[PDB]
Coordinates of C-alpha atoms in Angstrom, one line a residue:
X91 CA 6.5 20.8 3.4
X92 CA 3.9 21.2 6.1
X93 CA 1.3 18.5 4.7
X94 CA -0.5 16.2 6.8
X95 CA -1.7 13.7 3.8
X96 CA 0.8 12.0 1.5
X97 CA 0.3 10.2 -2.0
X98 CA 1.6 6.8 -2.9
X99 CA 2.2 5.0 -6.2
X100 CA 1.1 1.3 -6.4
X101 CA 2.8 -0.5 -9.0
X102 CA 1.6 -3.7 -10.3
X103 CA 3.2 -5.9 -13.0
X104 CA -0.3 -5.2 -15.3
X105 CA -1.0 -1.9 -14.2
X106 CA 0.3 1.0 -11.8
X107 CA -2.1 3.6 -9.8
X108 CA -2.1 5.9 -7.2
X109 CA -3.5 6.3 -3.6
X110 CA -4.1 9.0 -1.0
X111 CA -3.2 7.8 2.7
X112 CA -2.2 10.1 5.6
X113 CA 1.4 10.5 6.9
X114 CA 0.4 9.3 10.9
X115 CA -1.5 6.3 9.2
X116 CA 0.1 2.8 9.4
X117 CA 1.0 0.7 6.3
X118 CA -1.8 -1.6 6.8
X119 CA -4.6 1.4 6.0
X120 CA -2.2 1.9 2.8
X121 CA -2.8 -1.8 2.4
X122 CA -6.6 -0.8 3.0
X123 CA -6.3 1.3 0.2
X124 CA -4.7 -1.1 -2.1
X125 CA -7.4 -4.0 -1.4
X126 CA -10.2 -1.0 -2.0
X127 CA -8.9 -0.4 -5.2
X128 CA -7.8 -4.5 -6.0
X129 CA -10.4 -7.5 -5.4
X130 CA -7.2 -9.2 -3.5
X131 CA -6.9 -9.8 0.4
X132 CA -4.2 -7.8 2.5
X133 CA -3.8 -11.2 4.1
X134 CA -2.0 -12.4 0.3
X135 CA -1.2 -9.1 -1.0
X136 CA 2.2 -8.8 -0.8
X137 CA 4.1 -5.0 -0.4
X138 CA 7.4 -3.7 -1.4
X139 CA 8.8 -0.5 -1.0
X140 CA 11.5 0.6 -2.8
X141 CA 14.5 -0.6 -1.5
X142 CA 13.4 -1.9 2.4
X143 CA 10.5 -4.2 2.0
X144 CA 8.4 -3.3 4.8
X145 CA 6.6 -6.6 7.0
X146 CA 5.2 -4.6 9.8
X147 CA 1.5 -4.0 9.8
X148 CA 2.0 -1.6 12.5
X149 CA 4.5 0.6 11.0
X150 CA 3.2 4.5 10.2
X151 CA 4.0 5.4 7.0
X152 CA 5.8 9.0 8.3
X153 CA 7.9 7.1 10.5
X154 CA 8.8 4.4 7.9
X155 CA 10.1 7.4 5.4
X156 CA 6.9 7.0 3.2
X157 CA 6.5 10.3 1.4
X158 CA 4.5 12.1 -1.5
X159 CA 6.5 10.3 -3.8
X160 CA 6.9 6.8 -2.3
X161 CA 7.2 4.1 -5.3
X162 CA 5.8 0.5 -3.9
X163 CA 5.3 -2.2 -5.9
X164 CA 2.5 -4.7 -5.3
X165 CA 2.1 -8.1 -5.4
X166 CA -0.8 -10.0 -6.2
X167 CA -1.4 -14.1 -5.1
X168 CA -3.9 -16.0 -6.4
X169 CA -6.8 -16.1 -4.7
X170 CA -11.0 -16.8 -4.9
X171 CA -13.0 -13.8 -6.1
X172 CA -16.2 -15.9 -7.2
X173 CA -19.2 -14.6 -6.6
X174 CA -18.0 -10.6 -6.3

Protein backbone atom coordinates (compact mmCIF):
# COMPACT_ATOMS: atom_id res chain seq x y z
CA UNK A 1 0.00 0.00 0.00
CA UNK A 2 1.00 3.54 -0.64
CA UNK A 3 -0.68 5.23 2.63
CA UNK A 4 0.81 7.73 4.62
CA UNK A 5 -1.56 7.34 7.85
CA UNK A 6 -2.06 4.07 9.64
CA UNK A 7 -4.84 2.78 12.26
CA UNK A 8 -4.21 1.26 15.59
CA UNK A 9 -6.25 -0.84 17.90
CA UNK A 10 -6.07 0.04 21.67
CA UNK A 11 -7.10 -2.73 23.81
CA UNK A 12 -7.95 -2.32 27.28
CA UNK A 13 -8.96 -4.98 29.81
CA UNK A 14 -12.74 -3.03 30.06
CA UNK A 15 -12.93 -1.80 26.69
CA UNK A 16 -10.96 -1.80 23.17
CA UNK A 17 -10.96 1.24 20.59
CA UNK A 18 -9.33 2.47 17.84
CA UNK A 19 -6.95 5.48 16.75
CA UNK A 20 -5.65 7.19 13.71
CA UNK A 21 -1.77 8.17 13.97
CA UNK A 22 0.62 8.61 11.01
CA UNK A 23 3.20 6.08 9.88
CA UNK A 24 6.46 8.78 10.32
CA UNK A 25 4.93 9.62 13.85
CA UNK A 26 6.62 8.29 17.01
CA UNK A 27 4.94 5.96 19.56
CA UNK A 28 4.70 8.65 22.05
CA UNK A 29 2.00 10.88 19.65
CA UNK A 30 0.19 7.23 19.49
CA UNK A 31 0.44 7.55 23.29
CA UNK A 32 -0.90 11.18 22.61
CA UNK A 33 -3.75 9.59 21.18
CA UNK A 34 -4.45 7.14 23.77
CA UNK A 35 -4.34 9.81 26.82
CA UNK A 36 -6.79 11.98 24.35
CA UNK A 37 -9.11 9.34 24.36
CA UNK A 38 -8.34 7.99 28.32
CA UNK A 39 -8.20 10.56 31.44
CA UNK A 40 -4.74 8.55 32.29
CA UNK A 41 -1.07 10.09 32.00
CA UNK A 42 1.39 8.75 29.28
CA UNK A 43 3.88 9.08 32.18
CA UNK A 44 1.68 5.78 33.91
CA UNK A 45 0.13 4.50 30.91
CA UNK A 46 1.75 1.49 30.16
CA UNK A 47 2.01 0.14 26.08
CA UNK A 48 2.32 -3.28 24.69
CA UNK A 49 2.46 -4.27 21.28
CA UNK A 50 1.84 -7.51 20.27
CA UNK A 51 4.65 -9.55 20.77
CA UNK A 52 7.80 -6.81 21.34
CA UNK A 53 6.76 -4.40 24.04
CA UNK A 54 7.99 -1.31 22.86
CA UNK A 55 9.83 1.30 25.80
CA UNK A 56 11.14 3.87 23.39
CA UNK A 57 9.34 7.15 23.28
CA UNK A 58 11.32 8.00 20.36
CA UNK A 59 10.62 5.10 18.22
CA UNK A 60 8.34 5.90 14.80
CA UNK A 61 5.72 3.71 14.50
CA UNK A 62 6.79 2.81 10.45
CA UNK A 63 10.12 1.95 11.62
CA UNK A 64 8.93 -0.10 14.64
CA UNK A 65 6.66 -2.38 12.12
CA UNK A 66 3.37 -0.62 13.43
CA UNK A 67 0.88 -1.08 10.60
CA UNK A 68 -3.00 -0.60 9.73
CA UNK A 69 -3.63 -3.43 11.79
CA UNK A 70 -1.25 -3.13 14.75
CA UNK A 71 -3.05 -4.85 18.00
CA UNK A 72 -1.61 -3.04 21.30
CA UNK A 73 -2.89 -3.52 24.43
CA UNK A 74 -2.99 -0.77 27.05
CA UNK A 75 -2.43 -0.53 30.48
CA UNK A 76 -3.92 1.66 32.80
CA UNK A 77 -2.26 2.64 36.60
CA UNK A 78 -4.04 4.19 39.11
CA UNK A 79 -3.91 7.63 39.12
CA UNK A 80 -5.71 11.23 40.40
CA UNK A 81 -8.41 12.50 38.04
CA UNK A 82 -10.32 14.71 40.67
CA UNK A 83 -11.44 17.67 39.67
CA UNK A 84 -11.69 16.83 35.56
Amino acid sequence: AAVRKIHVTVKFPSKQFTVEVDRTETVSSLKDKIHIVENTPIKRMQLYYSGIELADDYRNLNEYGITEFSEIVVFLKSINRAKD
